[PDB]
Structure 1
């Protein structure tokens, strides 16, 4: 399925530390963020996505249209400018964030009743699994 709608609660988070370190997120921030349960709220209508990520101490919200390039300032993360593009490869939603960091982006897909999110930066891969609320 390409339907990623829903409220998704984090089951697992592997190598979030390595991903954040590759983004040059400060030590203090990383130490808090790695411990936190994330909730991902995805509102998907056709090509239009509105995504909200919440935890006790940090938020990150992004809206995008599949197949439409969009400039991003990664406020609250690493504060960089990237040129972002989100497209489908089969039922995998693929984001490339073109800019200073190499191999920066993410891939997201549904398998069973779970959402998988693979965050990449440089030589680091973070793997997250969410289950539907």
Structure 2
């Protein structure tokens, strides 16, 4: 039931991303660049395999994963994590686990916009994406 997430999305709003990055220990110079970067997220499916690409002028990432099946991931900030993505309440919930820590990356559709909520520790960041043709 992931179909409405699929496509190409552009960042159009960000709240508290610096807080989130700082909670994860990202260095100030990197946070400075990241705060001014507007990534493009591409979400594709091939049967029950999703691929999620994040493209920007700074860093790119790509993950592929089966819904509800754990996968190894190396994050943009070089954390080596155990990840799982599942559909929960109509949201794509990506949970990353490493060193007993956790962070969630939750995507929900609200009025045709894709809202990404990032939570680590007490930091909660909300990033809004709009669909590109």
Give the TM-score of the pair, scaled to structure 2: 0.89
Contact 1:2-1:110 at 8 Å conserved across structures: no
Structure 1 window deviating more from structure 2 (27-36 vs 50-59): it is 50-59
The alignment partner of 1:108 has SS state of strand
Question: Structure 1 residue 48: deviation in Å?
Answer: 1.4
Partner residue of 1:16? 17
The alignment partner of 1:41 has SS state of strand
1:51 equivalenced with 2:57 (yes/no):
no
Aligned pairs for 1:118-133 (under 5 A) are: 118-133=117-132
Contact 1:93-1:108 at 8 Å conserved across structures: yes
Post-superposition CA distance 1:98-119 (Å, at most 9, x none) = 1236341211111222111111
Q: Once superposed, which parts of structure 1, at least 4 consecutive aligned residues long, lie more than 3 Å away?
A: none
The whole-number CA distance in structure 1 between the counterparts of 2:57 and 2:81 is 27
Unaligned segments of structure 2, at least 5 residues? none
Aligned pairs for 1:1-133 (under 5 A) are: 2-3=2-3, 4-74=5-75, 76-77=76-77, 79-100=78-99, 102-133=101-132
The whole-number CA distance in structure 1 between the counterparts of 2:105 and 2:8 is 19
The alignment partner of 1:18 has SS state of helix
Unaligned segments of structure 1, at least 5 residues? none
The whole-number CA distance in structure 2 between the counterparts of 1:119 and 1:101 is 18
The whole-number CA distance in structure 1 between the counterparts of 2:47 and 2:110 is 20
The alignment partner of 1:44 has SS state of strand
Two-structure CA RMSD over aligned residues (Å): 1.6
- Count of matched residue positions in the alignment of Structure 1 and Structure 2: 131
Give the TM-score of the pair, scaled to structure 1: 0.89
Contact 1:2-1:109 at 8 Å conserved across structures: no
